[PDB]
Structure formats: structure tokens, C-alpha cells
Amino acid sequence: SNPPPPETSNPNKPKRQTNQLQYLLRVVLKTLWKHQFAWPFQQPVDAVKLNLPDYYKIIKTPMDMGTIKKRLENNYYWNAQECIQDFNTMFTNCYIYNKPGDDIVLMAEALEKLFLQKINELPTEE
Ligand SMILES: COC(=O)C[C@H]1CC(=O)N(C)C1
């Protein structure tokens, strides 16, 4: 079976809408989401459908852009660092689970290159 997804709603978690978080949605998430290689990363890994019964034995902090998109659209975060960390967890999980040179790793690398380019120009806080 699959684990429950990461949390995307938590009314008692303090949250903010900031210009950096707006950039993370409007620039970073949108750029990666529309990319031809986004699809494996647009929702939690379905270890049942994909026949990866060891996935959640190895990956204990799952993350995906569907979760990140919901967190941004629901104003789940307090700061940009928390969202940046989610993206990096997603990429790292992919590199940890898979073998070098696998298609999925090349896909992650292409998305990560764009991510790094956009993060390099994260606006200063208002
Ligand atoms: C469509 O799913 C794939 O192509 C590979 C799996 C495993 C992995 O790390 N993912 C992000 C999904």
C-alpha cells in the first residue's frame, strides 16, 4: 500500500503570503509544472501502480510537485525556505531511490537545472 500523502492543510500551522512565496508559485512551480518532464513529479509516487514495493521502505520523507502546488495554493507555508526544501527533498528522493542515468534521474536533473536558475533570482523580501 501507499502511505498517506504529505500534509497540505493544517489550520493551526501559522502561515504567510510573501513576495518570495508568490515567486515560488508564479515562477518556480509554474516553470517546472509545464515542462515536458514534469509528469512523474506531479503527484505522490504511487508505489502500487508503479510496482515499486520498496519505494517507501527507502524514502521516508516523500515529496512531489502536486503536494508543493497544493501547499503554495493553500498558503501552507510560513517562508520560502520551507518550499525550497520541499523541492530539494523531491529531487534528492529521486536521486537516492533510482540509478544514475535512469530516465527519471535525467528528468529530475532537467527540472532541477530550471529550479536552480529561478531560485538564483529569488527576489529580496518585501
Ligand atoms: C512515472 O514514474 C517514474 O517514471 C519513476 C518513479 C520513481 C521516481 O523516483 N519517481 C519520481 C516516479
| Grid cell at residue 125 | 523580501
Atom of ligand 1 nearest to the CA of 94: 9
Say how far apart CA 73 and CA 24 lie, in whole Å.
11
Q: How was this structure determined?
A: X-ray
Is 109 domain-assigned?
yes
Furthest-apart CA pair in the chain: how many Å? 46
| Nearest Cα to Cα of residue 58 among 30, 94, 5 | 94
Bin 101: left if φ > 0, else alpha if -120 < ψ < 50, else beta.
left
Structural element, H or E, at residue 24: none
Q: Rounded to the nearest whole angstrom, what is the distance from the C-alpha of residue 126 to the centroid of ligand 1?
A: 37
Q: Rounded to the nearest whole angstrom, what is the distance from the C-alpha of residue 24 to the centroid of ligand 1?
A: 23
> Strands, E, within 63-124: which ranges?
none
Is 95 domain-assigned?
yes
Distance between first and last Cα of the chain: 44
The CB-side HSE value for 56 (13 A sphere, CA atoms) comes to 16
Is 9 domain-assigned?
no
Is 94 domain-assigned?
yes
Is 86 domain-assigned?
yes
Mutation to probe ligand 1, out of 48, 61, 104 (largest number of atoms < 8 A from CB):
104
Q: Which domain holds residue 99?
A: 18-122
Is 2 domain-assigned?
no
Q: Rounded to the nearest whole angstrom, what is the distance from the C-alpha of residue 109 to the centroid of ligand 1?
A: 13
Is 7 domain-assigned?
no
Is 12 domain-assigned?
no
The structural domain count of the chain equals 1
Question: Residue 73 in contact with residue 8, Cβ under 8 Å?
Answer: no
- Domain of residue 85, CATH code: 1.20.920.10
Tell me, what DSSP letter sits at residue 123? P
Bin 71: left if φ > 0, else alpha if -120 < ψ < 50, else beta.
alpha
